[PDB]
């Protein structure tokens, strides 16, 4: 049984995965497939891949012991995107928008 704070985190996660945000969330649904995408330098540049399916698995498996650990993974996901891609690329604009959704709701965390 998740703590109250981790319940809030799980709610955020469900929201990020919902159809409401799909237009900009979809690149983050699954691990980057570097070979499929032709980005053969991705794993040289990104040492700690992260994506929402992995966050979801970790939540289901009770891997996260607190909200801070959850938030660090979601933010790592966005950071990888900002690290690999030029700041004016489409996928970066999507990341910024999804991160806005995440940060404003994470800020509503019950004490
Ligand atoms: C050539 O650069 C790319 O393809 C990067 C690696 C890729 N761009 C994208 C990307 C490029 C253009 C648009 Cl409009 C949306 C996403 C990408 C696409 C699919 C995907 O999972 C299936 C992950 C993507 N992703 C993420 C997350 N962070 N960077 C990307
Ligand atoms: C767009 C920045 O990379 C992240 O900003 C988060 C803010 C809550 O929109
Ligand atoms: Cl953090």
UniProtKB/Swiss-Prot annotation:
It is found in: Nucleus; Chromosome. Changing residue 37 to A: Reduced binding to histone H4 acetylated at 'Lys-12' (H4K12ac). Changing residue 32 to A: Abolished binding to histone H4 acetylated at 'Lys-12' (H4K12ac). Residues 1-109 form the Bromo domain. Chromatin reader protein that specifically recognizes and binds histone H4 acetylated at 'Lys-5' and 'Lys-12' (H4K5ac and H4K12ac, respectively), thereby controlling gene expression and remodeling chromatin structures. Recruits transcription factors and coactivators to target gene sites, and activates RNA polymerase II machinery for transcriptional elongation. Homodimer. Interacts with E2F1. Interacts with (acetylated) STAT3; promoting STAT3 recruitment to chromatin. Interacts with CTCF; promoting BRD2 recruitment to chromatin. The first bromo domain specifically recognizes histone H4 acetylated at 'Lys-12' (H4K12ac). It also specifically binds histone H4 acetyl-methylated at 'Lys-5' and 'Lys-12' (H4K5acme and H4K12acme, respectively). The second bromo domain recognizes and binds histone H4 acetylated at 'Lys-5' and 'Lys-12' (H4K5ac and H4K12ac, respectively). Belongs to the BET family. Some specific inhibitors of BRD2 that prevent binding to acetylated histone are promising therapeutic molecules for the treatment of cancers or inflammatory diseases. ABBV-744, a small molecule, has been tested on tumors with success: ABBV-744 antiproliferative activity is mainly restricted to cell lines of acute myeloid leukaemia and prostate cancer and is able to displace BRD4 from chromatin. GSK046 (iBET-BD2), which specifically inhibits the second bromo domain, is a promising therapeutic small molecule for the treatment of inflammatory and autoimmune diseases. This is Bromodomain-containing protein 2. The lineage of its organism: Eukaryota, Metazoa, Chordata, Craniata, Vertebrata. The gene is BRD2. The chain holds residues 345 to 455 of 801 of the full protein.
